[PDB]
Amino acid sequence: AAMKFTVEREHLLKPLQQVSGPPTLPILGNLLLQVADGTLSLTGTDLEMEMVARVALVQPHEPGATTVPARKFFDICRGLPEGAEIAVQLEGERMLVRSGRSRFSLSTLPAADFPNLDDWQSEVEFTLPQATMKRLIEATQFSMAHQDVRYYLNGMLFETEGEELRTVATDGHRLAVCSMPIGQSLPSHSVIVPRKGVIELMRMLDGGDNPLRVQIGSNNIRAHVGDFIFTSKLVDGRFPDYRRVLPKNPDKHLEAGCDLLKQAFARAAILSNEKFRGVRLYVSENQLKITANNPEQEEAEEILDVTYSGAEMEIGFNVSYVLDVLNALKCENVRMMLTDSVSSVQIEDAASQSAAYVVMPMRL
């Protein structure tokens, strides 16, 4: 009610942008603003997740709290000139924003009505560089399901075991797995982070040198990075046993230049069925032939020089799944591990086993 603060525009922008990340209830469209002991806290929530930003206050201030429309407040702050001093105070049930000769009066909702996230205890904690969390997410995110009825597939598995953190994502047709050493002995734990949580967690990594502190409870996950705290509910489901689906002992190995392979699959794709995306691979001695056809009886054929010595074989794949893997890999050469035409194929960088991709074929 007596909440007062003055802060430079540039010290508000990134915090305002981060908290607006997570309606039906009017208060969920607001940001909770709190002034307490030299800090301004900003909180945004969708009930499933919340983002809290802390801004140090070097200019005079008075304690208190309020809720203000998020988009309107951010747009005012963003719309002000570079270097503007933003003076904020309450006057009745209105929030007053003043800068230069610009005055704004915004509607408020009491701070006491802002939804608090349910208290929980962390069961596993670890610290990680931001780049490690970024690599784990980026290497696997494209493999998560898109609004699948097996709801546990729409998120990403976060699994700790020994000194390692691993991410796993699948849609039941293709899978991605990334394992990274974290240098801290961890209890064995597995949780599913929802799609929106993964996006928010990725969006919070500024690409700087501040480490990420992760706390995982039974039904919640918390990530602290610099002056930001992101909390998300976990997906209440059981992830499939992905260990079962990695080819254990493949008898066929193919190696090819990533760029040439990606370009050939990209051109073949043009003439694949628009909904089904099926392409045929014919593997023979040091050769890969890629074919595609559609209901219009149009046909594409690509012939490439590869490294391959095994038995001749034909295998069908959804070309979008193959292209997704080739675009996720950023290496000179790729290696493909195969058994037969009705079994999964493993794809990986020919010089790194950090990330593995498993694609189930299509019936030809």
Binding site: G172, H173, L175, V245, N318, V342, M360, P361, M362, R363
Partner: peptide, 5 residues
């Protein structure tokens, strides 16, 4: 399209 599981 075949299933992993």
């Amino acid at each position: 399209q075949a299933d992993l599981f």
